[PDB]
Amino acid sequence: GPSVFLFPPKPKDTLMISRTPEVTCVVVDVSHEDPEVKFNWYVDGVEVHNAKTKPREEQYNSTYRVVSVLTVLHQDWLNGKEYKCKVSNKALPAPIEKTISKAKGQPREPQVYTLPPSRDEYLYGDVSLTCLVKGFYPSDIAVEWESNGQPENNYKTTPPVLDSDGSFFLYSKLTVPRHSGNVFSCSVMHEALHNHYTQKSLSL
Amino acid sequence: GPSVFLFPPKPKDTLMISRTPEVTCVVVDVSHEDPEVKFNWYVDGVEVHNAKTKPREEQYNSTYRVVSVLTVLHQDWLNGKEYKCKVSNKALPAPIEKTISKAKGQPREPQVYTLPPSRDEYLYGDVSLTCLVKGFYPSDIAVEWESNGQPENNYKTTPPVLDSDGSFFLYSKLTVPGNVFSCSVMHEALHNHYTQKSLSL
Numbered sequence: 504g505p506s507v508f509l510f511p512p513k514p515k516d517t518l519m520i521s522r523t524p525e526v527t528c529v530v531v532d533v534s535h536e537d538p539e540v541k542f543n544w545y546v547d548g549v550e551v552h553n554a555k556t557k558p559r560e561e562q563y564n565s566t567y568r569v570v571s572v573l574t575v576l577h578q579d580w581l582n583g584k585e586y587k588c589k590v591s592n593k594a595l596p597a598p599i600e601k602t603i604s605k606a607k608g609q610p611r612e613p614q615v616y617t618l619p620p621s622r623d624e625y626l627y628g629d630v631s632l633t634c635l636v637k638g639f640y641p642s643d644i645a646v647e648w649e650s651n652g653q654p655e656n657n658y659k660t661t662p663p664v665l666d667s668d669g670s671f672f673l674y675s676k677l678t679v680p681r682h683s684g685n686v687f688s689c690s691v692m693h694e695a696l697h698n699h700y701t702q703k704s705l706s707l
Numbered sequence: 708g709p710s711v712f713l714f715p716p717k718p719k720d721t722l723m724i725s726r727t728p729e730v731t732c733v734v735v736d737v738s739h740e741d742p743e744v745k746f747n748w749y750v751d752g753v754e755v756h757n758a759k760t761k762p763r764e765e766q767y768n769s770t771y772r773v774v775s776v777l778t779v780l781h782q783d784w785l786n787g788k789e790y791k792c793k794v795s796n797k798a799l800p801a802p803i804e805k806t807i808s809k810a811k812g813q814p815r816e817p818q819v820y821t822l823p824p825s826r827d828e829y830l831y832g833d834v835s836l837t838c839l840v841k842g843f844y845p846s847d848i849a850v851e852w853e854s855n856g857q858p859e860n861n862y863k864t865t866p867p868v869l870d871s872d873g874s875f876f877l878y879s880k881l882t883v884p885g886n887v888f889s890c891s892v893m894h895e896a897l898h899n900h901y902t903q904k905s906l907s908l
């Protein structure tokens with residue numbers, strides 16, 4: 504029978520009131536023979552009725568993919584409410600229930616450090632600006648770079664790594680062309696920061 | 708029906724002739740009604756006959772788990788040979804085939820850079836020594852720390868991240884509250900598959 508996956512909102516969306524955080528219930532391997540699928544949504548077990556179901560997509564393996572999207576309130580997500588997606592289909596015996604919520608436990612503020620390229624790296628045409636983000640909890644976080652107020656997007660960021668004290672860390676690497684707008688900033692968004700946002704700059 | 712999982716050797720094992728790299732074929736959810744399983748192994752499609760298949764193991768959920776281990780030659784793995792486990796069981800319609808190999812592509816040598824703690828971090832009781840390992844391919848790699856020739860184990864390493872040029876990078880962080888610290892990296896594209904970069908204070 505078909506299978507269900509339930510996805511949390513993107514971290515950046517929960518942390519800024521101007522954005523729209525969402526929970527996404529994805530159904531895979533929906534067949535032509537049994538192609539009707541229903542959705543019930545529950546917030547802390549309380550049925551909700553504001554979910555919107557997206558258009559199914561026939562996949563190259565002759566299966567169907569169905570998606571239901573529920574908008575959540577920023578503070579419901581951040582206060583630890585649970586969201587339950589129930590999927591009904593007559594090919595499945597019982598309805599499938601999946602639940603998700605923010606990780607439990609005391610949020611911890613990230614410390615942000617910018618580290619310049621090793622002197623050795625300059626023997627290459629591009630050097631790496633590093634941003635160490637450590638000690639945060641939970642692991643939901645967003646990291647971006649900018650210079651002179653505009654985004655710098657030639658960066659990659661590691662996933663969060665569980666550290667030995669139960670907090671998380673990550674690094675973000677901005678690749679720059681060695682000439683050094685000599686001022687670069689690492690921007691970090693996390694629920695435990697004041698105004699959910701902080702910047703740490705790097706001279707060159 | 709039963710399921711097959713095929714595991715590669717540990718990166719360190721392919722890189723040192725003193726270690727013994729192995730490919731491991733694990734079969735789960737074998738039933739009592741049809742519990743005989745046969746393994747056939749192939750290297751680049753040519754059947755090989757030196758795998759060591761262990762005794763089936765009844766699990767607490769009343770399934771059996773059978774595992775077969777094929778020792779591989781270091782240079783076969785690094786030369787990109789494909790290892791195929793074929794698993795036969797009377798409960799299966801057809802035999803299950805799983806194949807594994809080193810990631811395809813031209814190997815690229817890692818650059819290793821050690822970065823000292825931000826001076827700001829010292830206002831806390833523990834500081835982070837950073838080891839940047841970038842530009843490597845494939846992503847199979849080993850990273851370790853030592854000081855004064857002995858292992859240092861208060862470190863964590865990120866998984867490899869695909870960079871924009873198709874190579875990988877990672878960071879490794881050593882937490883210290885031995886003034887010479889070394890980040891050691893093993894990778895197929897390095898000379899003698901090993902390099903070190905040290906950091907004072």
Ligand SMILES: *[C@@H]1O[C@H](CO)[C@@H](O[C@@H]2O[C@H](CO)[C@@H](O[C@@H]3O[C@H](CO[C@H]4O[C@H](CO)[C@@H](O)[C@H](O)[C@@H]4O)[C@@H](O)[C@H](O[C@H]4O[C@H](CO)[C@@H](O)[C@H](O)[C@@H]4O)[C@@H]3O)[C@H](O)[C@H]2NC(C)=O)[C@H](O)[C@H]1NC(C)=O
Binds near residue numbers: 529530564568
């Ligand atoms: C027909 O083709 C489609 C499209 O390729 C296949 O759909 C994929 O099926 C696989 C497994 O059947 C799914 O793998 C799962 O991915 C999950 C997350 O990734 C998806 O969701 C996010 C949504 O934002 C995307 O960013 C991402 O790119 C993917 O779209 C994982 O969470 C799943 O993990 C679960 O199972 C593993 C089992 O080990 C556990 O470790 C986990 O805890 C968890 O239980 C899983 O890895 C994949 O998501 C499907 N893609 C889509 C788009 O739905 C069909 O499988 C294929 N049909 C066949 C082959 O018969």
